[PDB]
Amino acid sequence: TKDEVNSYLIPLNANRQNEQVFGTNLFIGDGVFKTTLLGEIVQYYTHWSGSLRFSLMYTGPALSSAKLILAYTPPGARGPQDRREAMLGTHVVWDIGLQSTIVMTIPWTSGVQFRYTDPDTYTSAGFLSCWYQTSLILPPETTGQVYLLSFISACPDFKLRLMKDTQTISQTVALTE
Amino acid sequence: VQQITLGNSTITTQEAANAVVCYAEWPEYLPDVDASDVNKTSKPDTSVCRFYTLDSKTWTTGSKGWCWKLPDALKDMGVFGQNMFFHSLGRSGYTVHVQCNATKFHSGCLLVVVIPEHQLASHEGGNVSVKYTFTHPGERGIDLSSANEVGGPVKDVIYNMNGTLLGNLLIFPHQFINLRTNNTATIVIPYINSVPIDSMTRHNNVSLMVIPIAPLTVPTGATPSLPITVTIAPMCTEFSGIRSKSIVPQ
Amino acid sequence: VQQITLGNSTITTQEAANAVVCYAEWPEYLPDVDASDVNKTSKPDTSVCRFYTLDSKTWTTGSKGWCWKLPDALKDMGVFGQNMFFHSLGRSGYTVHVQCNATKFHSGCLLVVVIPEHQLASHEGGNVSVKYTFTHPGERGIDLSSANEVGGPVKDVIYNMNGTLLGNLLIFPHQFINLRTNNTATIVIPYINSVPIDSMTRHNNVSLMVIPIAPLTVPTGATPSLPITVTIAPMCTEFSGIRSKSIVPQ
Amino acid sequence: VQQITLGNSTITTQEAANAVVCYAEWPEYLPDVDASDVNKTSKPDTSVCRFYTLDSKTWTTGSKGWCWKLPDALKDMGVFGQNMFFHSLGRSGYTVHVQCNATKFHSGCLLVVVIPEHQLASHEGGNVSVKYTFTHPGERGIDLSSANEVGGPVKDVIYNMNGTLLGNLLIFPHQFINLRTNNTATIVIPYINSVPIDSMTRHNNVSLMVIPIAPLTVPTGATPSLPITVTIAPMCTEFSGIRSKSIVPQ
Amino acid sequence: QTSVSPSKVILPRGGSVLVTCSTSCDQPKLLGIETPLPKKELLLPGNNRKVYELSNVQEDSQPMCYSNCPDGQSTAKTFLTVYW
Amino acid sequence: QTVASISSGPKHTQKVPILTANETGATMPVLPSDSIETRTTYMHFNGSETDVECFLGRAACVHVTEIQNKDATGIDNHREAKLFNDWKINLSSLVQLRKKLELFTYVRFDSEYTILATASQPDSANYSSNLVVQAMYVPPGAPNPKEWDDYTWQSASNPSVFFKVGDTSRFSVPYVGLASAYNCFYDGYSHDDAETQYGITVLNHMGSMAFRIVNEHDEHKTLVKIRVYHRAKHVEAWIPRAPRALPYTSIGRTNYPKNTEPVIKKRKGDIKSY
Amino acid sequence: QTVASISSGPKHTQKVPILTANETGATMPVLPSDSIETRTTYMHFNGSETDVECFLGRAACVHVTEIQNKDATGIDNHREAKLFNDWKINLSSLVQLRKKLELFTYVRFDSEYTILATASQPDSANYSSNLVVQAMYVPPGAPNPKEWDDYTWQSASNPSVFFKVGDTSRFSVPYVGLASAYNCFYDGYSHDDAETQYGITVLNHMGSMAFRIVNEHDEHKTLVKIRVYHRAKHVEAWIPRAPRALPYTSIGRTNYPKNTEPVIKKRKGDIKSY
Amino acid sequence: TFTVINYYKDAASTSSAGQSLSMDPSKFTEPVKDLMLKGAP
Amino acid sequence: TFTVINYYKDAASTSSAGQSLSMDPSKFTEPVKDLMLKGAP
């Protein structure tokens, strides 16, 4: 209901099989992305093109193990409702170990050369979902939810064209000192 | 004579079949300079580059014509249809082969024409839209002589279903099938679009219209119909963005 | 670390994943000297050469094992399945990636083994045959711990479902998934057959068996199961003889 | 392993401690081209270029975070503090070393971030100012989990005490202390200011924030806290305008 | 999601009705009503809601509000009936 | 000098250029010199006025709206009061221009806009006000102002031009389409849905213009009529099309009204009449 | 042509570029070519509109005040009567511009000012006056005029521009900060004192503008609204910053109001919903 | 006989481009090719 | 394609400068250096 640090923590549960971790649409100037640096700079422009860099950092105990599959579903198909559907598109099987961070690129996958930064059906960017590949296994003496941190950024091939005002901040009265 | 062999398919023509290549441009794969999508494209083999024959229409003395939309007409054709449904993006040229044979006693003239971006008009007026199911009929296409339907396009061939006059449709790449002269028409269509590649499902790049101009006049006592058969082969087809199979209405 | 990227798929492994290549032979396309079928083969693109993940099995303390048959397990997997159904002939290698992670407190050992021509025995004796539906289960495979069925294979893992002893299954290309050591197994399978190419539907070239040898012993108070996930990528796949889609039972 | 020896101080790390150098700029002495003050600067010896350890904070399951302001946190640290009080002008870089060790059973993630010109917001709204005593707390810093005070800054870590969202704080030079991966974070801060040198007392160049992002989850039955220790070494420190010792409030 | 008000209306033959199209999207690019009837967009501020006076309704019609908003159903149909 | 016709005498040609087969769909370039004995003439003509840049390239009034300067105290709907007005930019509302553009499938051009504001004071007024108009180009999909003195007008990003009523503003807008060219015809949908709109697409969004009178109110009401003139320049056009024959009914659709009059003129006489 | 993506085929890499450690605080430049097989595409793009000069570089209305031309006989407080008005220059009063600037810690720019004066005569008037506005830039700390016809307006040093109402003035002011850049954020005080103001500093003094109508009074009252537009040029920006999420409450402070609404939108559904 | 200086930095600001010299109608009037000379790629 | 004459003596009077060619994000994205290669002065 409120803005919390917990909004940034993607919960992972132990002993979940063939299950979904998270799923989101890829309207970068909206939804979960609206407040990120990428989304904020994106809302100042009307058009965007290029690839996105999506990262996940595992924060659970060192003695845990998990294989996740992060899937990008290009536009034209619904958000995947099962892992089988998800793994037919662009995906990365991530084995959590000494390297706690996976970096999946969302390749620019579009016919039209530019997409609208504001949500639009024609210029839809597809879907992003994460699923349990094997499962999460916690060591003994540990219980509860472990968390993933998801990061967003732009690849060096990113483009932003047509300047516009941002709808993030508003005013009805002039400010003073 | 002429023979075109694509994959495991062959069309032989005892007419000196001269092909129209729309705008003197052969189908080509998307070059790097024009590409925007970064994924390596899927360029199918013999499996798709082959002649698919659609079900034949019957040309009667009072038939108005038929309209197919590509790639919609081939959405259920072997491996091409599957690839079109499994990939997010696709571009393709076409070799269209319209066939209609008769005797030296028959008369009639078909206009075979390819219209890029043949946006259909609605018969209801105002700002009504033609529904998806009508603009994506499939291999059966649109029969211009049938009656109007709720959400269907207008079907007065005089106005090309778009508010332009039929006589002027020769500005588009076309061939006539004049029963005295020839029985086949061949048009090679390149990929035509404002974007380098596009979604094959929601957008029809071209429309193939076969229109009787000079009506069919069969000899006395003859059966008052002729079959018209359309054969299409995808050419320089590319697919990108493989994922779960798309779900379209009908 | 290791990363294998096929088409739009990527498997990352923080284990130094060493791959077994069956009989030190990489998958290869059929050379001219060995070819009999004259048709130009269809060699799919990124569209098929990619990792397909099967639904995960749960490894419990009393599970006997699982068996998949290729290419049957991939008959419903994206573009590969469609091509397998639309063509008369097909040959393919495979990169099998079996994944099973646990903690440093778990113990257990899986035998991941690839058996060419794994002809299954019937549990009924005499000369009864295992029915098509049981030898072509699909992505679910055969669970060796389930009960017998009329027309199904025998399911005593000690005898490999074929009358040979389990201990001897190491003569085939295999890897162990020892929970103390590794969590993934990778086997690269070439096309193995007495004929250069064959029908992908009626004949299973290889069988993938994942067998618990050392039983799963989870730490005290832990959930008594582990998921086992199989990921397969067709390699050097060829198809020949495209035609109407085959009709198989189930 | 790694060892950094400054003066008579040494920090050893059995982690491969990778240091973040803010904006890829090492601390440097003010060059002649940028200098405005004419006095020859005082460049202290080993006496100041050394690691000062601040008192440790306890990281509990419900702690919001801590904030230190430099050079305020070191105003009472050996010779550096004295020089900072006796001189009118001063500039300095810093090597910050945040230390927090746990076992392989703990989970939690600290965000260690350096914010130049971290102007704090007042919790009262309007145009109220945060009083000097609160923005110059010293080696104890600001504890974000404590309650508000009259004239103190706002302490909602979600908004960084300045009206910006926490998720976006990665634009600043930062390192995470992920208990599964690493136990130390090292950030090298250069002198950042619109003026070449400035008064060390009335202006805090940077703010060091250590924020729990992923909460501390200790193993069952374990003590529900971890100590966090901050170690700082002034780097390329200069002082100018020696005079009577400054008098500041508290 | 796209919405139309009223959901349904019964009106006399040849009469006028006010149909409202709305979106959940605050800033839609396409927002209108598809109908063969003569219509008049009422001067109204804002981007995500429109009002049309559909004049001279002669038959049973199904005016569809449309938009490009990707949340939910991007189209909504209302049902006009005539009594005479 | 480019030759229009070459001297040509009697011809007993066996390569008959006047017998062809239109069944092939080619317009073989048969010249007067092929069927009649000709003299040699020169063109004296470059065809500068038939180039698409000129054919589609003069300023045309593409929108007209009236706004008012009046006391705004005690009004809820400023848009209804005509205190301001916005307009999604389109070159389809004027039929002459639309038909010319619709002669092609894809068109790419930069836009030069000229806004002419003219004031009228129908009711009793003691003088003519010195009013200033604000024409704000809002990017595609950006929020339009909701009231006359909304903060949207003070946008730090939206291009705005302030000019006196009775005078003009001029500013160019580059080609702003997402695709390589505008789709003057689109045979598709925004996505695969059964009920979604046909033809009309967001690919052809050229922006929008909002207009208000910046001045506060005088004692009398001033009616300001704003005429937007668009001139296409740096024009590129592809795929010639059959010209429009029937009236239009809506923007972005090829629909024509039911019961339209015949286009082809009927002959006063039979087919033999001259 | 700059390459956006390179052709890349199957990869059995042991130097896994997609497994990293964000604990280090580096955004390793992982490209699409690293996780998927790619084709070769080109950028066709320079990023001219994302340069800070363009991002922070169009004219925005930064102050609006109304002044009057009326009979000044028998008035003590001319400022209260709105005969003149002054304004300490600041780009913080408009939130769009403030947030854009606050994306950086230090900003250096020259200022181009455009002042638009528009006249209104709400009460009965026989005609529209030909008024002249004086916009006087007063240097930081210089005395502002105290009455409408004070001698401060006849300053031999203060830059002044005289222009007709209804028209504009334009003049540039160089970067006038004492330090090498403006402190859009200042974590300090003017001196070491227990009670002194925090944040707001004299380092960022850009001057002040005074406005009056030079004309003597007519028989009627004329209301003149002055809009000051600022355009930053020759912009240099340092130290990117977390964008502003909450409303502002004052100039020069980072304070936000109590009981503010949540910034992060709540999801319509659980974390798995698309 | 004629002179133009570009006063603005943007290409969209320049006056009209003029005439496309190389005009050739064979694209539309002579799009026929024999498909037995293998012109197809 | 473009021309500018400076009409005023002050640098503050010139139009905007244009684009900063040499743009490189590694300052912000790759600020990590090993401190065991003695990069510090």
Side-chain angles (χ1 to χ4, degrees), chain F residues 78-140:
Chain F
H78 292 178
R79 175 71 159 287
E80 186 182 24
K82 306 215 176 191
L83 288 178
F84 78 96
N85 183 247
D86 78 303
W87 165 70
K88 181 184 175 298
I89 299 160
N90 75 82
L91 314 181
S92 298
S93 168
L94 197 84
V95 299
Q96 289 291 330
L97 180 57
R98 185 178 176 172
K99 178 175 173 164
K100 276 203 285 188
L101 281 166
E102 282 194 348
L103 278 175
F104 311 93
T105 308
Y106 307 109
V107 174
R108 187 198 178 98
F109 54 78
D110 304 324
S111 306
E112 179 171 288
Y113 294 98
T114 312
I115 303 163
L116 172 78
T118 52
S120 66
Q121 304 185 140
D123 302 325
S124 192
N126 284 331
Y127 59 95
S128 179
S129 298
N130 311 136
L131 302 178
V132 174
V133 178
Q134 178 177 6
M136 187 164 67
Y137 175 93
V138 314

Side-chain angles (χ1 to χ4, degrees), chain B residues 11-33:
Chain B
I11 57 168
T12 60
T13 76
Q14 288 202 29
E15 293 267 354
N18 52 89
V20 159
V21 186
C22 304
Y23 314 105
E25 259 288 307
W26 290 96
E28 62 161 7
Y29 291 127
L30 177 60
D32 290 351
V33 68

Side-chain angles (χ1 to χ4, degrees), chain D residues 23-84:
Chain D
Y23 314 105
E25 259 288 307
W26 290 96
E28 62 161 7
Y29 291 127
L30 177 60
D32 290 351
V33 68
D34 290 318
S36 177
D37 172 295
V38 297
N39 312 278
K40 191 195 293 297
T41 61
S42 179
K43 304 183 181 71
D45 309 281
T46 48
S47 55
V48 310
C49 186
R50 63 185 312 282
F51 286 107
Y52 300 103
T53 301
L54 285 58
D55 281 12
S56 299
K57 300 308 187 172
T58 187
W59 178 14
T60 69
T61 191
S63 56
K64 300 294 182 175
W66 311 263
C67 174
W68 295 267
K69 282 170 183 303
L70 289 168
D72 171 68
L74 299 181
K75 72 192 164 192
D76 286 354
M77 292 294 193
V79 176
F80 176 90
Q82 298 300 320
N83 273 274
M84 159 169 165

